[PDB]
Structures are given as C-alpha cells and as structure tokens.
C-alpha cells in the first residue's frame, strides 16, 4: 500500500478533477464542431486524434479510479455511468454507438457536484411515483389493445399494431393534433370514436397532473 | 354453516388471490397477442379456448365470492366492478362487447391493493369538484348553443349541431388547432369570431386550472 | 307599507325562488331544442310563445324584486346581471341580441347559491392579479407594435395590423402552431425571427404561470 | 452645491415624475398610431416631430438624473435601462434600431413603482434556477448534436445544423406538432426515431415542470 497511496493523492487531487473537467468542456466544444461539415473537411484529422486522445485519458482515469476505490467504485452510480460512457466510446465505429459517444458530455453533470444535487433530487423522487406510472402504463396497454382492434383495420398507420396504438395514444395524451389530426378523421368512419378518446383524455391528462404534482413536491421538499 | 366455512377458507386464501392474479397477467399478455394477425392465424384456437377457460374460472370465483360475502359483496365497488366485467365477457360475440372484454385487465387494479389506494384517492377527490364540473358543463352548454346558431349554417362540420359545437368547444379548450384550424377559418366569414373564442379560452382554460389545483391538492392531502 | 309586506312574502318565498329556477331549467332545455331545425319546423310556435311567456314572468319577477329591494337591488351584482339579461332579451330581433338571449341561462348560477360561491371566489381573486395583467398587456402591446412593423409588410394576415399582431401573439402565447404555422414560415424571409419569438415565449408563457399560480392560490385560500 | 440643490428639487419632483409618465403614455399611444399607414400618410410629420421632441425631453431627463444621482445612477438597473433605451433611440435610422425604439415604452414599468415590484420579484427568482437552466441547456446541446448527425442528412430543414436541431428540439419541448409534424415524418425513414424523442419529451417536459414550480414558489414567497 505504498504506490497505492501515491495514485490516491493524484486521483483525489483538485488538479486532477479540474483537469478532467477541462477536457470534458473542450471535448464538448469539439463534438459540436464535428457538426460543421465545413469545419470537418479541414480539421477532421486534428479532431479525430483529439477524440482518440481524450478517450485514452478518460480510460486511464477510470482505471486509476478503480484502483483507488476498488469495490466502492461500482457501488457509485456516478462512476458506473462514467464507466459505461467510456466503454461505449471505446468500441470502434464498426454504427449508432458512434453517436452515443456524445453521452460522455453528461460527465459534466457527474464531474460537477453543483449538478449532481439536481439530478439526484429528481431521480430519488421517481420510486415514489413508480406506482402511478404502472397505473398509466396498464391504462395505456388496455386502451392500446382496444384501439388496435377498434380502428386498426381502417387506420393502420395510427392503430394497425399495438405499438402503433401505443404511439398514437401517447400523442393524444400530449394533446398534439388529437382532434384535427386523429379523432376527426376517425369520426368520418366511426362517428362515436369520441366516446373512446374524450374519456381517455380526461383520465390520462388528469392522472398526469397528479403524477406531475407528486413528483414536483417530493423534489421541492427534498431540496 | 359447515361447507360455508370451507369455501370461505378457500376464497380468503393467499393462494386463491395469487392464483387469480396469475391468470389476469396471463390473460393480459394473451389479449395483447390476439393483436397480432400473424400470431392469431396460428394460435387462435389455443387462445380462444384459454379465453373460454379463464372466464369460467373467473365466473366460479365470483360465485364463490358471493356465497362467502353475501350482501357485503354488492356493497363493495371493487367487487361490483369485477362482477360487471365478467358479465360483459359472458355475453357472446353476437359486437363491441367483444372489445369491452379487455376491461377485465383492470381487475389487476382491483386484485392488487397497492393499486386500489391510488384509484380510490382519485375517485374520492371527485365529489368535491362536482360543483365546478357543473359550472363548466353549464358554460359549455350556453356557448355550444350560441356557436351552433352563430356559425353552424356556414360551418356545419364544427358547429352544425349542439353536439358538434360541444365537440369543437372541447377541442378549443384543449387549445388544439384552435386558431389555425378553427378561428382563423371562421374569421374569413365572421371577422369578430375572436370576441367569442378568446373570452371562452380565458374563462375555461383558467377555470380548468382551478379544477386542476383543487383535485390535485385533495388527493395530495388524502395521501 | 301594507301591500309591500305582501309582495315581500311572495318574493322572499321558497316557492317563488324554486318556481323561477324551474323555468330557467325548462327554458334551458327549450333553448337547446331550438337548435334542431327538425324540431323547430314542427314546434317553433309552441317554443316562441313559451319564450315570450318566460320572459314576461322574468320581467314581472325583476319588477317585484325591485319594489321589495329598492336601491339595495342595484347594489347587488347578481341582480344587476339578472336585470341586464332580461333587458337584452326584451329588445326584439330587430340581430346578435337574439343570440345573447341565451345568456339568461347563467341565471342558474345566480339563482343557485351553491354556484355563486364558486363564481364569487373566482371573481374576487382577479383584482389582486390586475397588476400582472397590465404587465402582460403592456408586453403584448410593445411586441404587437414591433411585429407589425417587423413582419406585416410581407405577412399581412398575421401581422399587417396592430390587432392582427395582437391576435397572432396571443396564438403564439397559447403555443398553438407557433413554429410550424408561424415562425418557420417567417424564417424563410426573416431568418432571425426566432430571436423575437423565443424570448417572447419564455417571458409570456412563464409570466402566465405566475399569473396562474397567484390566481389559483387566492381562490384556494378563500375557500 | 447651490444649483445642484435646485435641479435636485426639480428631478425629485412629483410633477417631474408625473410629467415623464404623461409623455410615456402619450408616446405609447403615438407609437401605435404610427402602425396605421392611413394615419401616417396624413400625420407622419406631426408624429415624427413629436418623436424627436419626446426623445430630447427624455435626454434632458437622463442628464439631470445623472447630475443629481452621480455614480448611484449607474448602480441602479432601472436607470441603466432608461439610459440604454434612449441611447438606442438616439442613434438615427441609418435599420432594426428604428424598431427597438419602442422598447422605451417599458419605461412605464420603470417609472411606475407598482410595476417594478412585479418585475423585480420575477428577476430575483431567476438566479436560483440558473442551475436547472444549465442542466437543460446541456441536455439540449447533447441532444442537438445527436439529432444533427442522426437525422440532418435526410432532414436538413429540421436537423441539418446544430442551431436547426436546437430550434426543432425547442419546438418538440413545447410539444407543438411534435408527432404529426416531425416524428411521424422521421419514422418513414428512421422507424426507431421515437426511441430518441419520447425520452427527450419525458425528461425535458418534466424537468421544465420542476423549473416551473421552483420559479413559481420563490416569487410567491418573496411577495
Ligand atoms: C460539454 C459542455 C460544452 C458546452 C458547449 C460550449 C459551446 C459549444 C460551441 C460549439 C458551437 C459549434 C458551432 C457550429 O458548429 O456552427 C455550425 C453552423 C454552421 O455550419 P456550417 O456552415 O455547415 O459549417 O452554425 C450554427 O449552427 C450556429 C451554432 C449555434 C450553436 C452554438 C450554441 C452552443 C450552446 C452550448 C450551451 C451548453 C451549455 C452547457
Ligand atoms: C412503457 C413502455 C412501452 C413500450 C411499447 O409499448 O413499445 C411499443 C411502441 C413502439 O413500438 P412500435 O411497434 O415500433 O411502434 C412504432 C411506431 N411505428 C411503427 C410507426 C414506427 O412504443 C411507443 O411508442 C409508446 C410510447 C409511449 C409509452 C408511454 C407509456 C405511458 C406511461 C406514462 C408515464
Ligand atoms: C371505459 C371506456 C370504454 C370506451 C368504449 C368506447 C367505444 C367507442 C366505439 C367506437 O369508437 O366505434 C367503433 C365501433 C365500430 O362499429 P361501427 O360504428 O358500427 O362501424 C360501422 C362502419 N362499418 C360498417 C364500415 C364497419 O362503433 C361502435 O360500436 C359504437 C357503439 C357505441
Ligand atoms: C394484465 C397486465 C399484463 C401486462 C402486459 C404484459 C406485456 C404484454 C406483452 C404482449 C405484447 C404483444 C406483442 C405483439 O403482439 O406484437 C405485435 C406487433 C407485430 O405484429 P405482427 O407483425 O402483425 O404479428 O409488434 C409490436 O407491436 C411490438 C409490441 C409492443 C408492445 C409491448 C409492450 C407491452 C407493455 C405492457 C405494459 C403493461 C404494464 C402493466
Ligand atoms: C357533459 C356530457 C355532454 C354530452 C354531449 O353534449 O354530447 C354531445 C357531444 C357528442 O354528440 P354528437 O352529436 O354525436 O357530436 C359528435 C361529433 N360528430 C357529429 C362529428 C360525430 O359530446 C361531445 O363531444 C362533448 C365532449 C366534451 C364535453 C365536456 C364538457 C366539459 C366539462 C369539463 C369537465
Ligand atoms: C359573454 C361572451 C358573449 C360572446 C358574444 C360574442 C359575439 C361574437 C360575434 C361573431 O362571432 O360574429 C357573428 C355575427 C354574424 O353576423 P355578421 O358578422 O354580420 O355576418 C355577416 C356575414 N354574412 C353577411 C354573410 C351573414 O357577427 C356579429 O354580430 C359581430 C358583432 C359584434
Ligand atoms: C339551463 C340548464 C339546462 C340544462 C340542460 C338540460 C339538457 C339539455 C337537453 C337539450 C338537448 C337538445 C338535443 C338536440 O337538440 O338534438 C339535436 C341534434 C340533432 O339535430 P337534428 O337532427 O337536426 O334535429 O342531436 C344532438 O346534437 C345530440 C344532443 C347532444 C347535447 C345534449 C347534451 C346536453 C347537456 C346539458 C348539460 C348542462 C348541465 C348544466
Ligand atoms: C387587452 C385587450 C386588447 C384588445 C385589442 O388589442 O384588439 C385588437 C385585437 C383584435 O383586433 P382586430 O384588428 O379586429 O384583429 C382581428 C383579427 N382579424 C383582423 C384577422 C379579424 O384583439 C386581439 O385579438 C387580441 C386578443 C388577445 C389579447 C390578450 C392580451 C394578453 C393579456 C394576458 C391576460
Ligand atoms: C427584447 C427582445 C427584442 C426582440 C428583437 C429581435 C429582432 C428580430 C429581428 C427579425 O425578426 O428580423 C427582421 C429584420 C428584417 O431585416 P432583414 O433580415 O435584413 O430582411 C431582409 C429581407 N429583405 C431584404 C427582403 C428585406 O431582420 C433583422 O434585423 C435581424 C438582425 C438581428
Ligand atoms: C405606453 C402605454 C400606452 C398604452 C396604450 C394606449 C392605447 C393604444 C391606442 C393606440 C391604438 C392604435 C389603433 C390603430 O392604429 O388602428 C390600426 C388598425 C387600422 O389600421 P388602418 O386601417 O391601416 O389605418 O386598426 C386596429 O388594429 C384596431 C386597434 C386595436 C389595438 C388597440 C388596443 C390597444 C391596447 C393597449 C393596452 C396597453 C395597456 C398597457
Ligand atoms: C441557450 C442559447 C443557445 C443558442 C443557440 O444554440 O443558437 C442556435 C439556434 C439558432 O441558430 P440558427 O443556426 O440560426 O438556427 C435558426 C433556424 N434557422 C436556421 C432555420 C433559421 O438557437 C435556437 O433556436 C434554440 C432556441 C431554444 C434554446 C433553448 C434552450 C433550452 C433551455 C430551457 C430554458
Ligand atoms: C439517452 C437516450 C439516447 C437516445 C438514443 C436513441 C437512438 C434513436 C435511433 C434512431 O433514431 O434511428 C437512427 C438510426 C439510423 O440508422 P438506420 O435505422 O439503420 O437507417 C437506415 C436507413 N438508411 C438505410 C437509408 C440509412 O437508426 C438506429 O440505429 C436505430 C437502432 C436503435
């Protein structure tokens, strides 16, 4: 436990932490410049090396963190996250993982404590509401089944499939185009379709308000 | 009261209750597979028998529950529900009742106590707001009448009928396409239509917020 | 003050009040049947006489109420209302007043005390918020002027006039079609229009939430 | 400090303040009449001189305020504002500044204390939420980058550029046309696009509710 104390004083360093945060902001700026095709045509090599650099440094960092923290590291969600977001980035382009790499910019939430407080407030609120979520999901499922067989033969895009009915009922819940776009069309064939979707909007768009209030009191009380 | 005590120990059984819940989840999965026309073409018989099985078991269950609970059974809303949702399912396809059968999946709310607490909180909130509901319904009715005769001759789809005006005013209340889709069209013929619908949106979409707050405090206080 | 005590015991009667309420509900049903052109072609005379009857009875009622209550009658808003809604109905069809007659169905709010409590709660909340209203109205006016001259030459339907800009900014505030319908079109000519409407949506749709909370706490505290 | 006390009694005058407010309301009315092309063709000269008058008086006023208040003037935000909104108006039409001149009507908020209380309540709430804002902005940025490269090749108008993806994600957050207008189109090419936008709507449209509650409690508690 001689060298172990040496890398512990490096890992626990105020410089080390600040150095990591400096790269995250740098890489975040860089990942937004990779958006410009103009910029990329002239600096893709400069950037792709910088991308391969920052990921090695982030890999060294994780390995150090593991030696210093041992099994306590995997008890930490913020570290588990940091782990999975460099592992994703470690797998080569051989093609959607190339896009998930930008999730590493969320380390700026992990690495910055002022941010963790907010996320953790929000995430801890959720298990209390897990029961209302299962009510609405059961409610969606019961109605998604009904709508599939109530309107999916004549309206396949919106209701031809359980998942399609799930998606459309979600859209109705957000109220987006629910009447002009969906229910008025359905009423040219099924004049009583409003007996299905008006009760659905009452229940769901009012249960949601409770789910809203509940979540947004627990977080208020915690902080 | 000798055999009565025997079926009471069966009905009140932890196994019995758990056995019923196991079927509900099974049937719920099954009722979602009946959505796939692919799956149905190959397993419709397997499923339709399973449907006829689960409904007999649910019928036996209700009859037992009635012998055990006698008139206390019909004093129980959760049991009245369970009753009406197997009766609906008992009537054959001879054709919308075939769809209402899936309402039996809501027994998963009845059979699971962790769920009843949430529903019952919500339902008990409602009688307090019944007075605001009757205000808005009177408000809709007074304005539905006005709009029918104010714009139903030139705009029959939206306002040609009391019920059509009711439906459109409900759509305006949710604010969906209210201007681009309804009021701007009306203003090509009736340039002052906004004197009707802007006050309607103020009142209704602000009374609704009160109805929202009221309901979503009573439920918060009850729990 | 001999006959005065006689009509006071009639006006203050539980029968009298209940008799008036009976007509309001009757007339309300009748005013909804006048919506059906089918019904009207066969019963217009029956109804139009019934309309002329109920309005005479309502006129007698108001005159009695005035003799009994004298100047206290005009100190009462609920009576002032009842007054103006039979006066409107008194003016003949010689043509929008024919439609405002249905406002008499709001006497069902006046005549029923269980309803007055709710309305009066809401109306008393308003003077406290009158200051935030004047902020938003000043805000609309300042931006309605800007948008008229910022986009009314190339977009006359939405912004060619102060009032047209007022109407469109109100639509943007409700968020209805604000991007697909208005700002994306504007950005084909004015690529920076989003510098105008995104700050406008922030401020207004967030001030509104305060105006919402304020109103919907005062009413909650009053009741 | 002899003449200094003279202009201090003028600046601090109840007449002086009231005289300034009288012009603001006058100019505000006038700036709305400059909207009418009819009115302008006949009274542009009358108005443009009145505009050049009011701005000189407002300039004299600011100079007096500076002599009286010295460095305390620039410590005052309400005065800094008044300063910058006459300076903007001082620069000639030589062309968007011609439109920003109407921002001087906001002096009616500055000059009227009943209004400052409301604005200042709102503005002081904001620094507490500055941390949640930076979360959502980081969240937008991470997703704006993803969407640009996830859909900007086949959907350039909505996602071809970081800023375009920023604008569209803002539109999705307000929920305007999010499904009919954006995600359903995307799903004709990218059938799993809903795996991107449904989680985005959950997080953002629920974090926003917290940002809403937080802001609209601080302001409620302050007042
Ligand atoms: C990890 C945290 C890092 C925080 C982010 C730091 C700031 C990010 C700067 C990177 C901006 C890249 C700008 C850019 O790529 O321009 C592209 C297009 C023109 O493309 P093109 O003409 O094809 O070349 O032109 C545009 O699209 C205009 C660019 C508008 C986007 C700039 C706004 C960035 C806000 C970042 C806020 C994050 C706060 C946490
Ligand atoms: C809960 C999770 C349920 C997941 C689920 O049911 O997946 C089905 C659908 C997507 O399946 P899919 O068949 O791919 O439909 C996609 C639409 N399409 C075909 C046009 C591309 O998934 C959806 O689109 C449903 C999205 C909303 C589910 C929200 C559940 C409400 C709970 C409230 C909190
Ligand atoms: C708890 C809430 C439960 C919600 C149940 C609401 C049911 C809504 C009924 C509905 O949307 O309409 C679907 C069915 C279809 O039958 P139908 O209207 O007869 O379709 C005739 C058109 N044709 C001849 C070409 C097939 O039409 C009906 O069966 C409507 C009868 C009611
Ligand atoms: C009583 C409580 C029971 C709880 C429900 C248990 C889970 C339900 C599983 C049943 C899912 C059936 C999937 C299915 O039918 O696929 C159909 C289509 C393809 O159809 P096709 O190609 O025509 O054959 O492909 C699809 O549409 C994809 C399927 C997406 C829907 C699956 C999401 C189910 C979420 C259930 C959550 C309920 C929580 C209480
Ligand atoms: C309260 C219950 C009032 C029920 C009612 O008035 O029924 C009339 C309409 C539906 O009648 P209907 O004549 O079938 O109109 C359907 C539209 N159509 C013709 C195009 C198929 O029903 C409606 O569509 C009205 C739906 C919303 C009523 C909500 C009342 C607001 C209370 C706020 C809580
Ligand atoms: C409590 C809130 C009560 C709400 C009352 C608001 C009234 C809104 C009036 C409105 O929407 O316009 C409808 C009427 C129709 O008359 P009008 O505008 O003269 O229609 C002329 C078109 N023509 C010749 C082909 C018949 O136009 C008018 O009468 C507008 C006059 C005001
Ligand atoms: C002063 C308070 C009184 C309270 C109101 C009492 C109930 C009102 C009943 C009057 C309903 C009139 C029904 C009607 O006119 O049918 C018209 C159309 C068919 O028209 P058409 O085929 O042309 O003959 O067919 C339809 O549009 C279907 C009718 C749907 C509307 C009926 C819903 C009335 C809800 C009233 C709730 C008010 C609560 C305060
Ligand atoms: C406050 C009262 C302001 C009244 C006002 O400014 O009137 C102007 C406009 C209507 O004037 P108008 O020139 O008739 O425009 C109508 C649209 N058109 C031409 C296509 C038929 O009136 C409007 O359409 C504005 C409606 C919304 C004003 C709401 C003010 C926000 C306060 C938030 C509480
Ligand atoms: C407090 C919030 C104050 C809000 C101020 C936001 C200003 C938004 C500017 C805007 O929407 O664009 C309007 C102007 C019009 O000038 P411009 O973009 O040059 O129009 C050129 C098109 N043409 C040649 C056919 C005339 O374009 C510009 O001036 C944009 C420059 C910034
Ligand atoms: C600094 C605070 C001052 C407060 C504002 C004082 C009131 C403002 C009055 C100025 C109204 C100008 C009316 C006008 O220009 O008419 C234009 C068009 C017809 O144009 P055109 O036919 O082309 O001639 O016709 C119309 O667009 C109808 C006009 C509707 C807008 C009038 C509503 C003004 C509400 C102001 C509320 C501000 C409260 C703080
Ligand atoms: C935060 C400030 C971020 C500013 C920023 O990223 O600027 C990029 C875009 C506008 O850039 P631009 O490239 O001009 O896109 C305009 C759309 N176009 C091309 C069709 C005219 O700006 C936007 O349109 C984004 C507008 C919403 C940003 C809101 C950030 C969410 C925070 C929640 C509080
Ligand atoms: C934290 C939340 C992170 C959100 C990640 C969600 C990812 C959503 C994926 C998505 O929207 O689809 C985009 C990609 C594109 O690949 P792909 O669907 O294969 O496009 C094929 C069309 N083609 C041949 C003409 C190129 O399609 C996929 O890769 C979908 C696979 C999952």
């Amino acid at each position: 436990s001689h060298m172990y104390l040496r890398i512990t004083n490096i890992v626990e360093s105020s410089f080390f932490t600040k150095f990591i945060i400096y790269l995250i902001v740098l890489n975040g700026i860089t990942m937004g410049l990779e958006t410009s095709k103009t910029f990329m045509q002239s600096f893709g090599v400069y950037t792709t090396l910088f991308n391969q650099i920052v990921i090695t440094i982030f890999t060294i960092e994780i390995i150090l963190r593991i030696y210093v923290h041992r099994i306590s590291f995997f008890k930490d969600p913020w570290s588990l996250f940091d782990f999975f977001v460099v592992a994703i980035s470690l797998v080569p382009t051989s093609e959607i993982l190339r896009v998930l790499r930008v999730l590493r910019l969320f380390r700026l939430v992990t690495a910055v404590p002022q941010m963790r407080k907010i996320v953790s407030a929000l995430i801890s609120v959720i298990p209390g509401m897990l029961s209302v979520i299962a009510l609405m999901t059961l409610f969606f499922y019961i109605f998604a089944i009904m709508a599939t067989q109530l309107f999916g033969e004549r309206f396949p895009e919106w209701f031809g499939t359980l998942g399609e009915s799930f998606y459309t009922l979600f859209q109705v819940m957000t109220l987006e185009s629910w009447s002009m776009g969906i229910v008025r069309p359905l009423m040219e064939v099924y004049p009583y379709a409003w007996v299905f979707f008006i009760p659905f909007i009452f229940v769901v768009t009012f249960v949601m308000i409770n789910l809203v209030v509940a979540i947004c009191v627990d977080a208020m009380a915690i902080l």
Side-chain angles (χ1 to χ4, degrees), chain A residues 1 3-5 7-8 10-17 19-36 38-66 68-69 71-74 76-92 96-97 99-116 118-153 155-217 219 221:
Chain A
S1 158
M3 183 62 171
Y4 162 78
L5 265 306
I7 74 183
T8 296
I10 308 189
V11 159
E12 296 277 313
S13 174
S14 184
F15 166 69
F16 187 70
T17 311
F19 180 72
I20 287 303
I21 298 170
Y22 188 69
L23 296 195
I24 292 177
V25 168
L26 251 66
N27 200 212
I29 292 180
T30 280
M31 282 189 152
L33 293 176
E34 305 193 290
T35 279
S36 164
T38 294
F39 167 92
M40 275 277 95
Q41 281 178 338
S42 321
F43 305 86
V45 51
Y46 283 57
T47 298
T48 324
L49 299 196
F50 183 91
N51 262 74
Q52 183 96 359
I53 291 191
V54 179
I55 189 180
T56 42
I57 302 182
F58 283 171
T59 315
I60 305 307
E61 182 207 1
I62 277 297
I63 299 166
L64 302 192
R65 295 245 294 279
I66 294 169
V68 178
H69 285 90
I71 199 179
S72 281
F73 173 98
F74 303 109
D76 189 51
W78 309 95
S79 301
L80 291 173
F81 183 71
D82 296 8
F83 184 61
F84 287 123
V85 201
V86 300
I88 281 155
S89 310
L90 263 199
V91 187
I96 193 187
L97 288 95
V99 163
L100 292 182
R101 300 200 185 157
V102 76
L103 291 177
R104 77 167 68 123
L105 300 197
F106 280 117
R107 283 194 97 264
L108 200 68
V109 166
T110 288
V112 169
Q114 294 143 63
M115 295 280 149
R116 291 191 262 103
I118 315 176
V119 175
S120 73
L122 296 142
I123 291 185
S124 319
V125 163
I126 299 183
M129 286 46 256
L130 176 143
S131 204
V132 175
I133 268 65
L135 194 59
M136 278 191 304
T137 309
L138 176 79
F139 196 81
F140 269 62
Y141 182 76
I142 289 175
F143 273 60
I145 294 181
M146 275 174 144
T148 286
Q149 48 185 31
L150 256 190
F151 325 109
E153 200 189 60
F155 296 89
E157 189 196 336
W158 302 334
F159 300 115
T161 278
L162 242 194
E164 268 153 10
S165 300
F166 253 103
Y167 177 94
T168 307
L169 288 178
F170 184 82
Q171 172 190 320
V172 171
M173 177 188 67
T174 75
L175 297 186
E176 196 261 292
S177 302
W178 74 265
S179 186
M180 296 305 247
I182 300 289
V183 177
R184 292 223 187 240
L186 257 61
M187 287 204 283
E188 314 286 11
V189 181
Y190 305 106
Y192 293 109
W194 61 272
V195 184
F196 188 95
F197 293 85
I198 303 292
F200 178 84
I201 289 175
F202 275 154
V203 181
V204 185
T205 301
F206 143 83
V207 162
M208 261 276 148
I209 303 187
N210 265 331
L211 177 63
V212 158
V213 173
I215 281 187
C216 301
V217 156

